[PDB]
Amino acid sequence: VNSFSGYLKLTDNVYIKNADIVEEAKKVKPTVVVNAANVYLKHGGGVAGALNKATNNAMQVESDDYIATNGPLKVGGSCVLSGHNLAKHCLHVVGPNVNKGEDIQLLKSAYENFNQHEVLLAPLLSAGIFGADPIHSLRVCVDTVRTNVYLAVFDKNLYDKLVSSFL
Ligand SMILES: Cc1c[nH]c2ncnc(NC[C@]3(O)CC[C@H](C)CC3)c12
C-alpha cells in the first residue's frame, strides 16, 4: 500500500492521473520522481523547467555540477540525483527528441531505466517539445516498465483521450 491517490488503473503496475507532477510530488513526496530531461540537464521548460522551478533552481545547480564532472547523458540514459523538496530522489531520464531526428526506438531504452526503481512518479517520456505521440509513449511504457509506475499527465484533453484508448 502506498500514498498515491485517485489514480486510474491502466494495467497491473501502471496507474494514471490528470495532474501536475509537481503538485503530485509536493503532496506525496515519493521516493523517486522522474524528470523528462535532456542530455545536458538544462531544465528550461516542460516537466524539467517545472520541477526545477519548484526546487528554487537547486535542481539546476546540482545538475550543472553533475555535468561538469561527468559530461552529458546518453539519449535513452539516466542519472539519479537529489529530489530536493519534491521527492527523495529524482531520476533524470532522457527520451529521444524526435523533432531533432533522434531514434524513436530509444524510447524503450529510456523507459528501461524505470525498472531499477520499485515505485516511481513519472510523466510520459518524449512528449512535449520532444514531439512524440503521447499514445505511443504510454504504450511503450506499459510494454517496458515492470515496476510500479504512477503517471501524471498535465493536459486534461490529452488525459481524457489517453484513458479512452487501447494500449
Ligand atoms: C509542463 C508540466 C508541468 N507539470 C507537468 N506535470 C506533468 N506533465 C507535464 N508535461 C507533459 C504532459 O503531461 C504530456 C505532454 C503534453 C504536451 C503536456 C502534458 C507537466
Side-chain angles (χ1 to χ4, degrees):
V1 183
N2 58 48
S3 65
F4 288 102
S5 148
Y7 281 69
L8 199 77
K9 187 176 184 61
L10 301 187
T11 67
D12 177 42
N13 61 301
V14 184
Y15 282 75
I16 196 157
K17 187 179 178 179
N18 182 192
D20 189 337
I21 199 178
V22 175
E23 288 305 315
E24 288 296 311
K26 284 198 284 189
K27 181 71 175 177
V28 174
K29 312 217 203 307
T31 303
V32 179
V33 66
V34 173
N35 182 31
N38 58 63
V39 298
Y40 306 110
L41 302 177
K42 285 313 178 197
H43 310 304
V47 165
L51 288 170
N52 176 58
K53 177 179 182 184
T55 75
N56 184 43
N57 210 51
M59 178 180 286
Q60 191 65 66
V61 172
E62 177 193 34
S63 293
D64 287 353
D65 170 83
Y66 173 91
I67 297 285
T69 297
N70 301 108
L73 299 179
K74 301 172 180 177
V75 181
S78 71
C79 68
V80 180
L81 290 174
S82 177
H84 300 277
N85 51 317
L86 303 176
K88 189 165 189 282
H89 304 285
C90 179
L91 180 69
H92 295 271
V93 180
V94 184
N97 184 345
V98 335
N99 294 334
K100 268 206 226 103
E102 300 179 345
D103 181 8
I104 191 71
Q105 297 294 314
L106 292 172
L107 187 57
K108 187 172 183 77
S109 301
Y111 275 115
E112 290 171 342
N113 296 288
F114 289 25
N115 289 322
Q116 302 293 318
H117 302 277
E118 288 202 339
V119 181
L120 315 88
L121 167 64
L124 288 174
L125 297 179
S126 290
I129 79 156
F130 280 4
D133 192 357
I135 324 177
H136 178 66
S137 183
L138 176 55
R139 266 155 197 171
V140 174
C141 179
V142 158
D143 292 341
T144 304
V145 181
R146 300 176 299 283
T147 54
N148 294 321
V149 56
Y150 290 82
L151 295 165
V153 176
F154 198 30
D155 182 294
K156 166 194 285 186
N157 289 325
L158 179 55
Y159 174 85
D160 288 345
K161 177 211 252 187
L162 289 176
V163 298
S164 283
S165 329
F166 75 79
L167 27 138

